[PDB]
Amino acid sequence: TFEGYFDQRHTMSMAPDVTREEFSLVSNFFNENFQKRPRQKLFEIQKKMFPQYWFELTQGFSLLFYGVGSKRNFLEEFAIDYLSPKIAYSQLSIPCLILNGYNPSCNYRDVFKEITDLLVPHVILQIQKMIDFYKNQPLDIKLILVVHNLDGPSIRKNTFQTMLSFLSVIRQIAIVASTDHIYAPLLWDNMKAQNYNFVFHDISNFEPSTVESTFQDVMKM
Amino acid sequence: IKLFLSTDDNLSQTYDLSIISKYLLIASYICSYLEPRYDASIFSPRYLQPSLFAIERLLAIFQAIFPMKANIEVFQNLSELHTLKLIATTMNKNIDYLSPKVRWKVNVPWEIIKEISESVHFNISDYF
Amino acid sequence: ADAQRSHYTVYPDKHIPFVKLLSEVNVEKRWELYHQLHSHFHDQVDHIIDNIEADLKAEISDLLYSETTQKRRCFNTIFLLGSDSTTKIELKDESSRYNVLIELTPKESPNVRMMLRRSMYKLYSAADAEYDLSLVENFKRLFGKDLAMVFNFKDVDSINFNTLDNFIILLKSAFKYDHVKISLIFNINTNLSNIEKNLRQSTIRLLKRNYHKLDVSSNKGFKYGNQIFQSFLDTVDGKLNLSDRFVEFILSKMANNTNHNLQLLTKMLDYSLMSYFFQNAFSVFIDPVNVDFLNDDYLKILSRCPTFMFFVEGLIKQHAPADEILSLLTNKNRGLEEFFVEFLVRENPINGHAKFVARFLEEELNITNFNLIELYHNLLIGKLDSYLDRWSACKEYKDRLHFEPIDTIFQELFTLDNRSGLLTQSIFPSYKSNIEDNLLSWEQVLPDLDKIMAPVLGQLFKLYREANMTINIYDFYIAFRETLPKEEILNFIRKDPSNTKLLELAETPDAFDKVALILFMQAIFAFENMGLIKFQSTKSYDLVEKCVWRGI
Amino acid sequence: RIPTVAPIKLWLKKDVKNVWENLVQLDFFTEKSAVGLRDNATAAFYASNYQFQGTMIPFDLRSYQMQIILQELRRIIPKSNMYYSWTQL
Amino acid sequence: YDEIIFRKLGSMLQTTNILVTDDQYNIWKKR
């Protein structure tokens, strides 16, 4: 409660030093023997929720994934092995665009270039043109946009959030995203939340976050 | 007569806001003008510019004054207030809310906080 | 490895997105009925949205092009209250005048020098599609046509008011030319008076001479919300009913937003509609032609209706002829099937009365300042008399319109209600609260060191819950270290002798503290990523600051 | 100090804004640390690139310093002025 | 365990307590 907040000379060198190899040793050896089987069982149970997410994606809702643990493998598996093949072969070749937001050098111009090249026969004006174009176009899905770390350093910025928020207006684009920060829902105001149209699910999985920590070294301590 | 009694240089319930937003804006003013010393006693410089504070203080005071936990609507209303610029931050370009360096301050005068307190039946007048 | 790249692309029965109930043709029937009703609703939804968008542009064009007798030259000012960057405007193609839409975002206005340059750049680009004030001066001698400029200030509340105030005075010099006309559009999120505080009173007097004020919010007197809700009542056709609980949830979750309430309402209604057909098997009997689909499980579910219990117990407690009760007890001849068919035959005048009260208020009484959802919930509860008594004129027609709802047996199978919290966890999550609970109550997620050693993040949150606002990192490391079962850790470690480095590290006497510190470092980095903690690394890695607390 | 009778305007805070704007331009006031006219073009470039806090904070809370001290006012202001008696503390 | 994870995960497959359980009619049938 709020009372728990209102009521609340040593050095790091006093602890033994750690080398770069030793830091990787524990992270590699423990994670393969610790909680592997129960997390595999939890994953096998959670895989039963794919039809509901698929239906929501059909009905035009964006999906946001949150919870404790890494959220790479779940999103990648859903996008590749389950979502795109069904989108293609149940309607009868869907580009599975994966964006790594935890990279602090993900230029928005480069991602917009790929999107424009893969969807089109002052970026905001071009996105508006695309939105006006695809309104009369058939509603079948073309692109899956997996946005890892929608709270990542390259992604937190206002301009990139504004760029992403307009993309969900186009029905033929499927948006899947995950966040880690506790105050992640602070990023989105009325307009951005309206355009995103997220449906929120708790995917707390205790998967060891290793890829996200790879980009920014932990050996600083 | 009434032409000569008012300047009429003005360009034109003044704010119609959600209840959560109203209480958030009450708590933010409390954060901005109450010294940090009193947070452990009262809840358990008007003429000067408002002091800075942290979101950790705002959430605690909001929880302590609303007649709520941490559902997304609270943060959505807070971000709406920032977009409305009823609350200011310590930056100008490339807003990076989640970065720890950013600090928050109130951009609303007392005359509006008083009316908000009246509309939500709150008693900010007794905390100072 | 592929994750090193910033972004990359990957390329690859006929699954109808529905799934079986009760552990083939029925699923297709249910999907087809659902999709029919769903498309019927979205047709009206899109029609209403397009009507809303078309409504504003007529007034906008009227304000822009309503010429007024003025010999003096001044800006044409339009105040779009409650507006947003998503709006659009198109311009008339007049005979002698050339019209250009000049958009001005706050990103495009760091100073007057950039503003004038970019305005002239856009003007020249439009003119050549068919960098200073000389271009405006020489525009007619270049292109032979008069110039009319519409400066659209896309977001006033974020623009540095000093730069805008000076740029308006800069544009004020342009009125020396007889061939130029200027119009300014202001997008304001807050009240109008928020601008008056920041601009200088010299500029306000320039703006005030010719200005127009317009509200473009979607919450204009419940009009469109009432229309959309009544369209939802129409598109159901009485095939499904809305309980008081679901209306209560809607009323509780609507008031927290004040700009785009229509979108939230549509989202909630669509989510409920798509949940109902996935959940309830009796949604197939929206089409009664499939009456032969009645089976054992449908009979069981019908027997599970509380209204059935009330009816049967009412018969029993009256000592009604035991043959009727024995017929269901012995399950013979299943006349309850025809009973349920007659139940399906029943009509609900609730919808008709709900529509007619609104129509009477709008047309006979001209009372448009009301909420249709509040009216519907008052009709559901029966307190309609007081709700109509909110207005003075509604006494005699209030007495006439008095309506009493009557339940039907097995109505629970054709009613949407909030009863298990699924509609709340999915649209209004307790994000931070959920994270806190999962860290503290990880048994809510997870199903021999695995059995004792909780997840490292939860174990660290245990200490995070109690410690001081600013934490000495050495003390925090000590507290984390003291929780380690060293002997059980050694037993866990020694299961993999195939890696030599594992034994080399583990058998070192410092290995316990080293592993504790490595796990501490990883957990603290994860906490920083989640926003849980912040280093004082600018000073030293000896102290860390807490940035979140439980419950609040 | 004017006795009440048995059976001077305080101008509104909004109207005083024009008076404040007039006085800020006539250099009677000055912003807390206003460097004013820069010396060279490079200094002007760095000044125009930066955004001062005093230009962002509300009109009611901008900090100012005074150019004419009250003693100079009492020297200059005629004693026939009604407000002259307040030229002392 | 299945019901708790189904409700926390927001799945629509979780039983909704508008209809009383079949086990309740294992009791009510004797009445």
Author numbering:
A (entry chain B): 242 to 249, 260 to 343, 357 to 385, 399 to 498
B (entry chain E): 289 to 300, 320 to 351, 373 to 395, 414 to 474
C (entry chain C): 16 to 27, 36 to 46, 51 to 157, 183 to 499, 512 to 616
D (entry chain D): 425 to 431, 448 to 529
E (entry chain F): 394 to 424
Q: How does the study describe this entry?
A:
The MCM motor of the eukaryotic replicative helicase is loaded as a double hexamer onto DNA by the Origin Recognition Complex (ORC), Cdc6, and Cdt1. ATP binding supports formation of the ORC-Cdc6-Cdt1-MCM (OCCM) helicase-recruitment complex where ORC-Cdc6 and one MCM hexamer form two juxtaposed rings around duplex DNA. MCM is a ring-shaped helicase containing six related AAA+ ATPase polypeptides featuring bipartite active sites with catalytic residues contributed by neighbouring subunits. Biochemical studies established that ATP hydrolysis by MCM, but not ORC or Cdc6, are essential to complete helicase loading.
To better understand the role of ATP hydrolysis during OCCM to SH transition, we employed cryo-EM to analyse the DH loading reaction on MH-capped ARS1 DNA, using MCM-Cdt1 complexes containing the Mcm2RA variant. We solved a 3.3 Å resolution consensus structure and separate local refinements of the ORC-Cdc6 and MCM-Cdt1 regions of the map improved the resolution to 3.2 Å for each sub-volume. Cryo-EM density for all subunits of the ATPγS-OCCM complex could be recognised in OCCMMcm2RA, however, the topologically closed ORC-Cdc6 ring transitions to a notched state, while the notched MCM ring becomes topologically closed. Moreover, cryo-EM density for Cdc6 in OCCMMcm2RA becomes fragmented, reflecting increased flexibility. As a result, duplex DNA appears merely clamped by ORC-Cdc6, and not fully encircled by a protein ring, as observed in ATPγS-OCCM22. The Mcm2RA N-terminal B domain transitions from partially plugging the MCM central channel (ATPγS-OCCM state) to a retracted configuration that creates the space for full access of the double helix into the MCM pore. In fact, continuous cryo-EM density for duplex DNA can be observed spanning the entire length of the MCM ring, unlike ATPγS-OCCM where the double helix is only seen encircled by the ATPase tier. In OCCMMcm2RA, Mcm7 disengages from the ATPase spiral and from DNA, while Mcm2 forms new contacts with the double helix. In OCCMMcm2RA, instead, three sites were ATP bound, while no nucleotide density could be resolved in the Orc1-Cdc6 active site. Within the MCM ATPase, four sites are occupied in ATPγS-OCCM, while all active sites are nucleotide-bound in the six MCM subunits of OCCMMcm2RA.
